[PDB]
Short mmCIF file of C-alpha atoms in Angstrom, two decimals:
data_model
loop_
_atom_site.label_atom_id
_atom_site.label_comp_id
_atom_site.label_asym_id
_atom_site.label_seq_id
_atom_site.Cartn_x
_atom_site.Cartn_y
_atom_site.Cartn_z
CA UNK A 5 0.00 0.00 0.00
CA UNK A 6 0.62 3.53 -0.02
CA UNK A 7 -0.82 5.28 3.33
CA UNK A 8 0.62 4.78 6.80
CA UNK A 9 -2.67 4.80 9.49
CA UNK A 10 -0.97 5.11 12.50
CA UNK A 11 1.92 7.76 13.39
CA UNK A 12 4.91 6.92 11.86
CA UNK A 13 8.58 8.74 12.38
CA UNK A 14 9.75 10.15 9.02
CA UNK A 15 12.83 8.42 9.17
CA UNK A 16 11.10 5.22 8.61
CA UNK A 17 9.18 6.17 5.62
CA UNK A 18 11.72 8.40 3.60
CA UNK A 19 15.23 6.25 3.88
CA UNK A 20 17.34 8.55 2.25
CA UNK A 21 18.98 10.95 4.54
CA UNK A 22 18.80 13.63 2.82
CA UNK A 23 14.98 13.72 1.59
CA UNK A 24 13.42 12.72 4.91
CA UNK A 25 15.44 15.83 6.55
CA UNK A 26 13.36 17.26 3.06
CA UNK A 27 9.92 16.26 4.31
CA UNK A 28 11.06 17.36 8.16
CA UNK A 29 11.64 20.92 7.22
CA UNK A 30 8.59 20.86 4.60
CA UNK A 31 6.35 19.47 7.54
CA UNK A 32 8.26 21.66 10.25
CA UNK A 33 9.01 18.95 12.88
CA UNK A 34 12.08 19.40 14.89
CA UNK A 35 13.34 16.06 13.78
CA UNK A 36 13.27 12.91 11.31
CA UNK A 37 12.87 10.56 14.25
CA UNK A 38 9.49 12.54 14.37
CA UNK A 39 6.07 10.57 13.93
CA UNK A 40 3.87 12.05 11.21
CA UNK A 41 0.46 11.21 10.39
CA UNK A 42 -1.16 10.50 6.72
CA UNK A 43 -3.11 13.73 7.01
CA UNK A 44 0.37 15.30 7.01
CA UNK A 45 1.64 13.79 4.16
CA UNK A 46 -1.72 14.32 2.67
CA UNK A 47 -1.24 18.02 3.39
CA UNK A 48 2.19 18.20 0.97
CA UNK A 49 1.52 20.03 -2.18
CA UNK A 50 5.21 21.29 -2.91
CA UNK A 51 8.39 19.66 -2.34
CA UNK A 52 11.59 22.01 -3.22
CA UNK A 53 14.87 20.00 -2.62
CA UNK A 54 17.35 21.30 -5.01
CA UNK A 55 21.14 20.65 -4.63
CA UNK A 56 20.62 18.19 -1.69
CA UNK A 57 22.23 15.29 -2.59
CA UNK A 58 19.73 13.27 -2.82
CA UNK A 59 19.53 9.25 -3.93
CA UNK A 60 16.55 7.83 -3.83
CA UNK A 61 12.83 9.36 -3.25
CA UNK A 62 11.25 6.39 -1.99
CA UNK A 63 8.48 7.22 0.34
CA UNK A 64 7.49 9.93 -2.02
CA UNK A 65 4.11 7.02 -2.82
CA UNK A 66 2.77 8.41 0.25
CA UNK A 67 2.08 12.36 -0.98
CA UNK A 68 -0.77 11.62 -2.78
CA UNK A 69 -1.81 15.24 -3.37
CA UNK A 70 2.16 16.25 -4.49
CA UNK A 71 1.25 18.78 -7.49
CA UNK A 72 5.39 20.33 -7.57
CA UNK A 73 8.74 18.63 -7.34
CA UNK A 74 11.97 20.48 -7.57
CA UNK A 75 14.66 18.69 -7.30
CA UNK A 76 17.34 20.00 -9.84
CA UNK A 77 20.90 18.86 -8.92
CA UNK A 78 20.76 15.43 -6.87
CA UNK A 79 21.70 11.79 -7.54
CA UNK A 80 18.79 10.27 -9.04
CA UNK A 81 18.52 7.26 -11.49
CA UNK A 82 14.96 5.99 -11.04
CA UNK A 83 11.43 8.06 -10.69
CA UNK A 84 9.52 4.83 -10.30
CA UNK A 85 8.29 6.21 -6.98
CA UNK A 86 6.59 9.39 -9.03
CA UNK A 87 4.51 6.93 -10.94
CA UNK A 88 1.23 7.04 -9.83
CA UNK A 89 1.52 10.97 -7.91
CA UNK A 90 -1.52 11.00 -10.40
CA UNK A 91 -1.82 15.02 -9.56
CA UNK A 92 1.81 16.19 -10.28
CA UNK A 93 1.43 18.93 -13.17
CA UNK A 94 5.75 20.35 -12.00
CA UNK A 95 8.61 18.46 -12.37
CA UNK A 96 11.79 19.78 -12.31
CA UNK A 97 14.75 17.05 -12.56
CA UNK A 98 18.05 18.86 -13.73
CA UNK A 99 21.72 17.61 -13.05
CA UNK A 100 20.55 13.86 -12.33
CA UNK A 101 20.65 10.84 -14.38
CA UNK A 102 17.50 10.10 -14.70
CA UNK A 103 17.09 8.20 -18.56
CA UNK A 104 14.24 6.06 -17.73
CA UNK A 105 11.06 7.73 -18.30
CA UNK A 106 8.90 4.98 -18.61
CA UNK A 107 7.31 5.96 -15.02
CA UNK A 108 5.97 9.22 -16.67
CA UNK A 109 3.72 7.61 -18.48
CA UNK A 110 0.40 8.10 -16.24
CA UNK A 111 0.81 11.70 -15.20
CA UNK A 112 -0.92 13.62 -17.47
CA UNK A 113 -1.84 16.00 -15.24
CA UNK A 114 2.54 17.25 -16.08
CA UNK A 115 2.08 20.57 -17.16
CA UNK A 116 6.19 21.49 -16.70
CA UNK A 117 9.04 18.94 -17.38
CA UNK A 118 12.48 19.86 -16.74
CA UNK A 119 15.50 17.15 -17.83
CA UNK A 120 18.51 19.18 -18.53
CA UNK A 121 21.80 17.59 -17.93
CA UNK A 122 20.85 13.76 -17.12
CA UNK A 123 23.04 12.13 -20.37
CA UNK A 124 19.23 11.88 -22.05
CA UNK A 125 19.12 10.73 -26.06
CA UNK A 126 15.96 8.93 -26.02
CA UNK A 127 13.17 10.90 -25.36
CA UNK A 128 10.85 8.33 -27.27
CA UNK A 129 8.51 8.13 -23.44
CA UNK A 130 7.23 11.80 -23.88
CA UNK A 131 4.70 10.23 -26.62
CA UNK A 132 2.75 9.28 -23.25
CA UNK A 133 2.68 13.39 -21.90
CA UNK A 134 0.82 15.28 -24.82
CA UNK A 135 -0.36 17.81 -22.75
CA UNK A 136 3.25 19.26 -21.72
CA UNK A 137 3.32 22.91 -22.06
CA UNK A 138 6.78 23.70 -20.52
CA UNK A 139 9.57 21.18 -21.66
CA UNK A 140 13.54 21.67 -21.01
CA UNK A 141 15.88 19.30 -22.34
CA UNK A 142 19.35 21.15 -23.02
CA UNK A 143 22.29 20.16 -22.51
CA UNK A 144 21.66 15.91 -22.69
CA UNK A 145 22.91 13.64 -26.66
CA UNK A 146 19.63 13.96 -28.42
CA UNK A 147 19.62 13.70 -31.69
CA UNK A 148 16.20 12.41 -32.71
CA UNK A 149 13.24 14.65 -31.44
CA UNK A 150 10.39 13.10 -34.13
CA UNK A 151 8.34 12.78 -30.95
CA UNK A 152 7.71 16.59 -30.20
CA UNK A 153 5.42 16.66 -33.05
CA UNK A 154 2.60 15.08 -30.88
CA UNK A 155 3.15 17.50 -28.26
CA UNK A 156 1.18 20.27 -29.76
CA UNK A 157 0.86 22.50 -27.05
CA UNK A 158 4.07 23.50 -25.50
CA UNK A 159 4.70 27.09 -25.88
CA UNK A 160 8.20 26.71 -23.92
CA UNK A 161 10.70 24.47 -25.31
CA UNK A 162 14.46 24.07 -24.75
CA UNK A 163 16.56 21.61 -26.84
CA UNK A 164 19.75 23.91 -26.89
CA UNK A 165 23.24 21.83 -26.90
CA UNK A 166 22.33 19.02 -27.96
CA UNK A 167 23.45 17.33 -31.56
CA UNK A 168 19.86 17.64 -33.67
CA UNK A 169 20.32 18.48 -37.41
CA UNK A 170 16.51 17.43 -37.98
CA UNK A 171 14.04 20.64 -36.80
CA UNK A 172 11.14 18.96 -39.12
CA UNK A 173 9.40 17.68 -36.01
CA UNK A 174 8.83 21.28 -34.78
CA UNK A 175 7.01 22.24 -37.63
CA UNK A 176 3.76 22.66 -36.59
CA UNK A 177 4.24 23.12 -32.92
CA UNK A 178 2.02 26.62 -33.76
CA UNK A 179 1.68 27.51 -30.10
CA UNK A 180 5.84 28.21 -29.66
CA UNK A 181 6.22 31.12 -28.00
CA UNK A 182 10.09 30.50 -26.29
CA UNK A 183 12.26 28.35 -28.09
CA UNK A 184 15.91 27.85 -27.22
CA UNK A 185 17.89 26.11 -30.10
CA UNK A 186 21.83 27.16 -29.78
CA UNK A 187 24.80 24.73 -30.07
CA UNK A 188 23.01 21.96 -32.02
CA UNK A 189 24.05 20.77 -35.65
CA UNK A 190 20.95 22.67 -37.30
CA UNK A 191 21.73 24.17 -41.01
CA UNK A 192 18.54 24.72 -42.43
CA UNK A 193 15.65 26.96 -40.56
CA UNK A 194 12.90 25.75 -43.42
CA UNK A 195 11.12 24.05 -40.28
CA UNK A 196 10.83 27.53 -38.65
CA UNK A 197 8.85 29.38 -41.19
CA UNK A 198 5.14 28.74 -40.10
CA UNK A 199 6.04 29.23 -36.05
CA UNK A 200 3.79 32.68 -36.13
CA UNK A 201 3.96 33.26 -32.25
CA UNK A 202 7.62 32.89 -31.19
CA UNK A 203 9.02 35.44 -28.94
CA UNK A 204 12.21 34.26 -27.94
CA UNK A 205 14.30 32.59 -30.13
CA UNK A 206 17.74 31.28 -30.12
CA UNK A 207 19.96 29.64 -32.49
CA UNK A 208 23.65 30.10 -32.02
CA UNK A 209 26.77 28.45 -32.09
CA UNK A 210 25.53 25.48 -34.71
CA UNK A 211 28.22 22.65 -35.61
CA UNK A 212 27.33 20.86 -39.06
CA UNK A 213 29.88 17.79 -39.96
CA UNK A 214 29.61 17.02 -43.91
CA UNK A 215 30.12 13.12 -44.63
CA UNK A 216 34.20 12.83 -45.77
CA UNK A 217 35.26 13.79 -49.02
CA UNK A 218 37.62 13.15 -51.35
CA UNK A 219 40.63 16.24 -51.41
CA UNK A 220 41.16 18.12 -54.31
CA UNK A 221 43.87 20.91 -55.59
CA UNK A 222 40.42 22.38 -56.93
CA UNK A 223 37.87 21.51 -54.15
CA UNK A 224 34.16 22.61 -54.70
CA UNK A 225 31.79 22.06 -51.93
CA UNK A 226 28.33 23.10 -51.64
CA UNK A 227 26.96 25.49 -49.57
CA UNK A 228 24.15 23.67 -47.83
CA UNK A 229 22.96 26.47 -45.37
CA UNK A 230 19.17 27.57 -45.51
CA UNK A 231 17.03 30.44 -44.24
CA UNK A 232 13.55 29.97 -43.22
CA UNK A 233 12.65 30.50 -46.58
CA UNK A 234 15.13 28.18 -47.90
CA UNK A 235 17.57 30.55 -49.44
CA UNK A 236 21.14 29.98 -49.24
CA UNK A 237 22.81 31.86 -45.95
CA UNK A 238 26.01 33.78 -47.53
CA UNK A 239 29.13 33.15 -45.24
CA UNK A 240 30.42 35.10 -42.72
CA UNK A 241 34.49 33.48 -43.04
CA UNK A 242 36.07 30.45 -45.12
CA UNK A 243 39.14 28.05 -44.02
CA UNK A 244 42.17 27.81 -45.93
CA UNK A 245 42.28 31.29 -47.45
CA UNK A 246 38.78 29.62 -49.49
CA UNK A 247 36.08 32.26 -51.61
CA UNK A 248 32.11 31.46 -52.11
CA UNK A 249 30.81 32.06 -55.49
CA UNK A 250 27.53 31.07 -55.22
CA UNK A 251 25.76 28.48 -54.54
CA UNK A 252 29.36 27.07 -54.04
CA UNK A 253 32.54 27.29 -51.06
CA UNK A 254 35.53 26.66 -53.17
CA UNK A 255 39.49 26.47 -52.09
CA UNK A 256 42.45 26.03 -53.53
CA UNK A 257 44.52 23.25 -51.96
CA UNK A 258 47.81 22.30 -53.50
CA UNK A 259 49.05 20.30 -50.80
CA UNK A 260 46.90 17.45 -49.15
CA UNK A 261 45.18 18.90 -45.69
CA UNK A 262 42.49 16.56 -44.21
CA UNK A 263 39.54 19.41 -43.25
CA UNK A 264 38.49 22.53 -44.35
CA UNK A 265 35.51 24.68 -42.74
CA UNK A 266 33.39 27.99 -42.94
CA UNK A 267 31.48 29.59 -40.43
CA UNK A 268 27.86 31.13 -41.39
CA UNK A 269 25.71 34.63 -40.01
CA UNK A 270 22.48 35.18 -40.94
CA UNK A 271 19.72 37.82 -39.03
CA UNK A 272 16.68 36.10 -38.44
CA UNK A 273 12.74 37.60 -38.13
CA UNK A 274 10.08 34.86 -37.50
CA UNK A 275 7.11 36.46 -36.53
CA UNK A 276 8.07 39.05 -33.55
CA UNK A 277 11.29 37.05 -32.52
CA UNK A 278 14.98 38.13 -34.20
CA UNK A 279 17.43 35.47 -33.88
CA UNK A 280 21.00 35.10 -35.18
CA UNK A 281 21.40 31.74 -37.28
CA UNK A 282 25.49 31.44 -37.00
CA UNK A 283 27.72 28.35 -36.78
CA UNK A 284 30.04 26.15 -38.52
CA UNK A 285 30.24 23.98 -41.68
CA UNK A 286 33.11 21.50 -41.27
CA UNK A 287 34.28 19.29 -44.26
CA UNK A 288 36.58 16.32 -43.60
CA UNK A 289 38.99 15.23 -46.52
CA UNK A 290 40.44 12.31 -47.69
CA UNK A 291 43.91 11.54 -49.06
CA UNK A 292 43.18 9.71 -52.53
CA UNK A 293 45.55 9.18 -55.52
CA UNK A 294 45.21 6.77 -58.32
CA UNK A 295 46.42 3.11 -59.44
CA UNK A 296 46.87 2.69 -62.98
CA UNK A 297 47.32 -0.74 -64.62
CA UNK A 298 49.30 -1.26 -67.77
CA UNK A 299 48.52 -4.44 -69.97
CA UNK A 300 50.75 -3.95 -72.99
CA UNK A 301 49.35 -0.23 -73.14
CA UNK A 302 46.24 -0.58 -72.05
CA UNK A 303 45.34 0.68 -68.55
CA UNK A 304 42.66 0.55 -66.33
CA UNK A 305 42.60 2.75 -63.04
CA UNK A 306 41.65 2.97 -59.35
CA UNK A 307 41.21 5.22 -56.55
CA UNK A 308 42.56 4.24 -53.50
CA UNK A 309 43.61 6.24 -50.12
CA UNK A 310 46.88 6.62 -49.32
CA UNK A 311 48.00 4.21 -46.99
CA UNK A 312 45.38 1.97 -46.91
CA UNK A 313 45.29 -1.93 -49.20
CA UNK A 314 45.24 -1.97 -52.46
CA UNK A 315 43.10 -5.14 -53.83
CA UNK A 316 44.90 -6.97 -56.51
CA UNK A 317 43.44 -6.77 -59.88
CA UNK A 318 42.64 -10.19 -61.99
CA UNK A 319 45.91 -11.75 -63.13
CA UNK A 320 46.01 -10.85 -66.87
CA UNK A 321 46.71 -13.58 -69.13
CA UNK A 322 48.16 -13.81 -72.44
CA UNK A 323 48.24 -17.13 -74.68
CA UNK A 324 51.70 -18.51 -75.19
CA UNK A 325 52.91 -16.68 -72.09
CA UNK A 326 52.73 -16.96 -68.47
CA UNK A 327 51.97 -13.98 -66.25
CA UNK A 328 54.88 -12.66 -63.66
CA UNK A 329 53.19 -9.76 -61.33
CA UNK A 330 52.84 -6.16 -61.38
CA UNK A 331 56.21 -4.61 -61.58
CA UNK A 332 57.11 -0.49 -61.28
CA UNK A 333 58.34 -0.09 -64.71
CA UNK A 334 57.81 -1.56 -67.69
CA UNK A 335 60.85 -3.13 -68.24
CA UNK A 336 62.37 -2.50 -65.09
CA UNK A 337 61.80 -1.48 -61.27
CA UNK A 338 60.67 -4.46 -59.01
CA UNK A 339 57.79 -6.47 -57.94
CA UNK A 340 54.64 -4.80 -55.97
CA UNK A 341 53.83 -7.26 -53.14
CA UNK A 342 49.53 -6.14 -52.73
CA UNK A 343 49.88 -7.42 -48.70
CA UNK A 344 53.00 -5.59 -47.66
CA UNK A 345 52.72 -2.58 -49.97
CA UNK A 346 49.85 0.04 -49.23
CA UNK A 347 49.18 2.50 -51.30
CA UNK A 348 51.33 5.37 -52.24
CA UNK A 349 51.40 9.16 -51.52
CA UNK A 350 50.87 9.62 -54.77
CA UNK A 351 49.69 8.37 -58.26
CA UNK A 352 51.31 6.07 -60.21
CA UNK A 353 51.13 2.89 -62.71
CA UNK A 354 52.03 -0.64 -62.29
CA UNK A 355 52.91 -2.74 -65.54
CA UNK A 356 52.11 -6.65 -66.45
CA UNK A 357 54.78 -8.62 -66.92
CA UNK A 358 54.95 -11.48 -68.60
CA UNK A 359 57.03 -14.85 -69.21
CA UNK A 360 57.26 -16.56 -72.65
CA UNK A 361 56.44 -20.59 -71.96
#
């Protein structure tokens, strides 16, 4: 059960040192050894027990009429105990580790969530809270928030540092009014346009990572950076000495370099909120040169990167003659051995050579 009905010290219901001196100064008794009655704990609409060092809130099962929890900056890992506080419409959970969120799944009555800094990156449970108006989540590893479009009537949302590219899922969350979106890998606002009642916006500091490409002396990448009305964002500074000339970033790179980058500034208006949309693009580079394979003049090639295995082609064969390996020269140089020798720093050709019977 979940109701004491006979006086009961504090101590005994709330194990964890720390929360039951909690519910002793909430209840005003000079002591946890004091007995307290259910009418007490039925009494208990707030609970504030922030930076208390906290472990465990068992016992909590007995404040049935609990409506606000604060307790940002303790040592929780578990909120089973919160489950079935049917009436709780605040909870405020910051600096814990609390990943599990399975136990939120009957209190919807949760008006204000607040999960900043607990290592979160599935948020897949807040399917079960559609009536959350107030959500902060910064600072955790999400990267896929597809579940916020079902929660269609926050008006206070916080997602900043955290690594989400995708913003679709905000699309039609109409009722925005405060939305915090800095330090994420976001590089195209298109998802922003139709938010007609933001305020506050914020969307600094972006990091985008392109997939790896291959180097060139002449390198051409494009610019992939979008405004809310999906024009291209011009950039505010380019790596390696590099020049835009639209809708391209292009550099000049004689000598191999494995990453190249440009940062990007663009004023934002949506609605009555003004924003600035700035970050950086970073492009990682490969180091690839070419194989070329001569059969008595006629060659075949393949790109390979430097230091890494080169495959050995199909032996060649030539009637009345018997192959004799890839060889540096023509008619010269030595043998290339494909499991000992890796790729080169550079281009170059290997010829067949062959062995009359």
């Amino acid at each position: 059960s979940e109701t004491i009905t006979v006086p009961t010290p504090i101590k005994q219901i709330f194990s964890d040192d720390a929360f039951a001196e909690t519910i002793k100064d909430n209840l005003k008794k000079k002591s946890v050894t004091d007995a307290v009655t259910q009418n007490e704990l039925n009494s208990i609409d707030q609970i504030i027990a922030n930076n208390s060092d906290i472990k465990s809130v068992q016992g909590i099962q007995y404040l049935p009429n609990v409506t606000k929890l604060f307790l940002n900056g303790n040592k929780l890992t578990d909120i089973k105990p919160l489950a079935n506080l049917k009436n709780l419409g605040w909870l405020f959970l910051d600096e814990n580790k609390v990943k599990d969120l399975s136990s939120l799944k009957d209190l919807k009555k949760l008006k204000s969530l607040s999960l900043e800094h607990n290592g979160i990156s599935d948020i897949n449970g807040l399917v079960h809270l559609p009536q959350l108006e107030s959500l902060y989540l910064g600072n955790n590893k999400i990267t896929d928030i597809t579940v916020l479009s079902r929660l269609t009537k926050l008006d206070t949302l916080s997602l900043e540092d955290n690594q989400i590219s995708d913003i679709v899922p905000l699309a039609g969350l109409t009722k925005l009014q405060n939305l915090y979106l800095s330090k994420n890998h976001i590089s195209d606002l298109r998802a922003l346009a139709g938010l007609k009642n933001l305020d506050v916006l914020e969307l600094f500091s972006q990091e985008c990572l392109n997939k790896p490409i291959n180097h060139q002396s002449n390198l051409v990448v494009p610019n992939t950076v979008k405004n809310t009305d999906g024009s291209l964002v011009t950039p505010e500074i380019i790596s390696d000495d590099g020049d835009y000339e639209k809708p391209n970033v292009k550099w000049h790179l004689p000598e191999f370099t494995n990453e190249v980058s440009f940062i990007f500034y663009q004023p934002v208006t949506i609605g009555k909120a003004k924003a600035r949309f700035h970050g950086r693009v970073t492009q990682p580079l490969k180091e690839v040169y070419t194989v070329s394979y001569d059969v008595d003049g006629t060659v075949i090639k393949y790109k390979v990167e430097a230091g890494t295995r080169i495959t050995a082609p199909k032996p060649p064969t030539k009637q009345g003659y018997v192959f004799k390996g890839w060889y540096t020269e023509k008619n010269g140089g030595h043998e290339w051995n494909f499991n000992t020798d890796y790729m080169s720093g550079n281009d170059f050709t290997l010829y067949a050579v062959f062995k009359a019977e």
